[PDB]
Design an enzyme around this catalytic site. Structure first.
Site, PDB file in Angstrom:
ATOM      1  N   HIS A  40     -21.381  12.790  21.903  1.00 53.02           N
ATOM      2  CA  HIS A  40     -21.186  14.179  22.227  1.00 53.02           C
ATOM      3  C   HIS A  40     -21.903  15.181  21.216  1.00 53.02           C
ATOM      4  CE1 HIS A  40     -17.628  14.178  19.373  1.00 53.02           C
ATOM      5  NE2 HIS A  40     -18.045  15.413  19.212  1.00 53.02           N
ATOM      6  N   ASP A  84     -18.286   7.008  23.277  1.00 51.45           N
ATOM      7  CA  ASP A  84     -18.826   8.154  22.535  1.00 51.45           C
ATOM      8  C   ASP A  84     -19.542   7.711  21.270  1.00 51.45           C
ATOM      9  OD1 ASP A  84     -19.395  10.717  21.780  1.00 51.45           O
ATOM     10  OD2 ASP A  84     -17.340  11.263  21.189  1.00 51.45           O
ATOM     11  N   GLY A 175     -16.295  20.303  13.533  1.00 49.20           N
ATOM     12  CA  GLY A 175     -17.385  20.171  12.574  1.00 49.20           C
ATOM     13  C   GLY A 175     -17.457  18.787  11.919  1.00 49.20           C
ATOM     14  N   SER A 177     -17.144  16.128  13.851  1.00 49.09           N
ATOM     15  CA  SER A 177     -17.634  15.339  14.968  1.00 49.09           C
ATOM     16  C   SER A 177     -18.718  14.383  14.526  1.00 49.09           C
ATOM     17  CB  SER A 177     -18.372  16.269  15.977  1.00 49.09           C
ATOM     18  OG  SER A 177     -17.600  16.842  17.028  1.00 49.09           O
ATOM     19  N   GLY A 178     -18.627  13.139  15.014  1.00 53.48           N
ATOM     20  CA  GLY A 178     -19.657  12.210  14.745  1.00 53.48           C
ATOM     21  C   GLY A 178     -19.610  11.500  13.432  1.00 53.48           C
TER      22      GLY A 178
HETATM   23  B1  LIG Z   1     -16.458  17.879  16.717  1.00 52.67           B
HETATM   24  C1  LIG Z   1     -15.086  17.118  16.529  1.00 52.67           C
HETATM   25  C2  LIG Z   1     -14.373  17.381  15.394  1.00 52.67           C
HETATM   26  C3  LIG Z   1     -13.107  16.721  15.261  1.00 52.67           C
HETATM   27  C4  LIG Z   1     -12.583  15.802  16.280  1.00 52.67           C
HETATM   28  C5  LIG Z   1     -11.274  15.278  16.007  1.00 52.67           C
HETATM   29  S1  LIG Z   1      -9.984  16.507  16.543  1.00 52.67           S
HETATM   30  C6  LIG Z   1      -8.506  15.816  15.861  1.00 52.67           C
HETATM   31  N1  LIG Z   1      -7.358  16.218  16.278  1.00 52.67           N
HETATM   32  N2  LIG Z   1      -8.605  14.835  14.951  1.00 52.67           N
HETATM   33  C7  LIG Z   1     -13.608  15.959  16.967  1.00 52.67           C
HETATM   34  C8  LIG Z   1     -14.647  16.177  17.556  1.00 52.67           C
HETATM   35  O1  LIG Z   1     -16.599  18.722  17.932  1.00 52.67           O
HETATM   36  C9  LIG Z   1     -17.614  19.769  17.789  1.00 52.67           C
HETATM   37  O2  LIG Z   1     -18.590  19.315  18.660  1.00 52.67           O
HETATM   38  C10 LIG Z   1     -18.050  19.632  16.201  1.00 52.67           C
HETATM   39  O3  LIG Z   1     -19.361  19.826  15.642  1.00 52.67           O
HETATM   40  O4  LIG Z   1     -17.069  18.643  15.605  1.00 52.67           O
END
Ligand SMILES: *[B@]1(C2=[C][C]=C([C]SC([N])=[N])[C]=[C]2)O[C]([O])C(=O)O1
Ligand SMILES: [Ca+2]
Length: 223
Positions: A40, A84, A175, A177-178
């Site tokens: 994603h 993902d 932030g 993510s990934g």
């Molecule tokens: B991501 C992103 C950040 C954090 C998660 C986990 S949420 C949780 N409750 N642990 C996910 C996905 O999404 C945006 O695209 C970004 O750049 O960070």
């Protein structure tokens, strides 16, 4: 990362920042030429930033390397977030050193209750917004599959696992993510999805990297 701690410069030497004019995702260096991130996080024009601590200051250990290729998993579903995961190839090999290092891929899946290290430059608030400049870390345990499914009914596949705290307060967030979930020194998860950050009964959901090792290996052997 909400409710974590400042890692310390270059103490997570496999953590990368993906940059498209700004930090937009994390990732994990798996060898000198490849990064694992979330599908994603896919976009064109990625620059990989290795050796980072403060993402807004050049501190002296960075390597900035453009991506040449990104490979989203063939079965990635952006609606469900099943599968993902994505590979990003560097245009030139990173120079591995104490501050820029690969993380091993798993040979077995991790166990419920294992403590893992989650890291990133995401928001540090559960309500509201503040972005750190330096890398933040969180130690979090893997949750049972039944707790995970009870937290997100109808949405957890065999390619996902939950980690964190059901009472909330400590979690990955926007932030991150990934980025990596490392358990026992192996990359076991990728920051994938969740409902809000650090909410009660809504832990993080992570891509189950152990189910993708054969795809990763075959992919890097041919690209
Ligand atoms: B991501 C992103 C950040 C954090 C998660 C986990 S949420 C949780 N409750 N642990 C996910 C996905 O999404 C945006 O695209 C970004 O750049 O960070
Ligand atoms: Ca920097």
């Amino acid at each position: 990362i909400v409710g974590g701690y400042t890692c310390g410069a270059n103490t997570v030497p496999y953590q990368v920042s993906l940059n498209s004019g700004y930090h937009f995702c994390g990732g994990s260096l798996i060898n000198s030429q490849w990064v694992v991130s979330a599908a994603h996080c896919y976009k064109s024009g990625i620059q990989v930033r290795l050796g980072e601590d403060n993402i807004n200051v050049v501190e002296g250990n960075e390597q900035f390397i453009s991506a040449s290729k990104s490979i989203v998993h063939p079965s990635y579903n952006s609606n469900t977030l099943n599968n993902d995961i994505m590979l990003i190839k560097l245009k030139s090999a990173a120079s591995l050193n104490s501050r820029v290092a690969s993380i091993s891929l798993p040979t077995s899946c991790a166990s419920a209750g294992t403590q893992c290290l989650i890291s990133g430059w995401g928001n540090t608030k559960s309500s509201g917004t503040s972005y750190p400049d330096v890398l933040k870390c969180l130690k979090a345990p893997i949750l049972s599959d039944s707790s995970c499914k009870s937290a997100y009914p109808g949405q957890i596949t065999s390619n996902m696992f939950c980690a964190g705290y059901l009472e909330g307060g400590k979690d990955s967030c926007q932030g991150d993510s990934g980025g990596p979930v490392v358990c026992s020194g192996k990359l076991q998860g990728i920051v994938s999805w969740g409902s809000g950050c650090a909410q009660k009964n809504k832990p993080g959901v992570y891509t189950k990297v152990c189910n993708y090792v054969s795809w990763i290996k075959q992919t890097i052997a041919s690209n």
